Design a protein around this ligand. Structure first.
Ligand SMILES: [Ca+2]
Ligand SMILES: [Ca+2]
Ligand code: NA
Length: 251
């Protein structure tokens, strides 16, 4: 008998525990095998528990076929059973996450992000707080970006703004680094899926921070095509500066 937020948190933790077990059982000799097992077993747990505890809700999971029944539903769980599979599959890495979000017909109303290797901490929309003090040196930004080849937009905004990119695996880990104050912002372009941003966005917004498309428009979920090209998540104070610079870069 859990609230949707309590369930999101419990699902995230439980999947987190299972992933930690898989990591210990399978080990790191074959990264691909380890990653596949984590993806598959975390997915199986989450679908089993959502069917048992929310039999009426639709589920959109990275690791399951998408039958689009969710388009007619008022309640949809949007989940990534293991975000940062590569990182998970690498010895010593703690930048991987479980994403559990509930979409209600519309916004992400309840959500949780677990970082299992970080003491299985679970960030949740019903307990995350709005006390964020501006961290770091004035006039300079630390921005979390993925461990891939940088988009054209960040190159351009770095001409005008002092920025140190911080390489972090996993969308969830990057978003929670914003929450923690380890970085000022998390910026992504070039493509992503709804389950990558739904739970982090829910938590971000619940913390009183900013989550939008790069052009400032709201993140939209439970779309036919669950692909979201770009995003910006950041401290509230930082949003005008970055949205401004992004818009200025389109000149
Ligand atoms: Ca995944
Ligand atoms: Ca992912
Ligand atoms: Na199963």
């Amino acid at each position: 008998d859990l609230t949707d937020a309590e369930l999101a948190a419990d699902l995230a933790a439980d999947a987190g525990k299972l992933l930690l077990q898989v990591r210990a059982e399978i080990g790191f000799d074959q990264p691909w095998t380890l990653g596949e097992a984590g993806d598959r077993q975390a997915n199986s747990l989450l679908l089993r528990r959502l069917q048992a505890e929310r039999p009426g809700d639709a589920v959109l999971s990275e690791e399951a076929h998408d039958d689009l029944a969710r388009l007619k539903s008022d309640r949809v769980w949007i989940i990534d059973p293991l975000d940062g599979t590569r990182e998970f599959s690498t010895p010593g890495r703690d930048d991987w996450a479980v994403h559990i979000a509930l979409w209600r017909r519309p916004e992400i109303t309840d959500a949780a992000v677990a970082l299992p290797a970080r003491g299985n901490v679970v960030y949740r929309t019903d307990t995350v707080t709005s006390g964020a003090a501006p961290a770091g040196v004035p006039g300079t930004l630390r921005i979390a970006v993925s461990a891939t080849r940088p988009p054209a937009v960040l190159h351009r905004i770095r001409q005008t703004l002092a920025i140190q990119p911080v390489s972090i695996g996993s969308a969830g880990a990057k978003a929670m680094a914003v929450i923690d104050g380890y970085v000022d912002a998390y910026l992504h372009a070039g493509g992503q899926w709804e389950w990558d941003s739904a739970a982090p966005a829910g938590v971000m917004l619940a913390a009183g921070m900013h989550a939008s498309r790069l052009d400032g428009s709201p993140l939209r979920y439970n779309q036919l095509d669950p692909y979201l090209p770009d995003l910006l998540m950041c401290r509230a104070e930082v949003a005008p500066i970055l949205l401004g610079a992004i818009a200025d870069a389109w000149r």
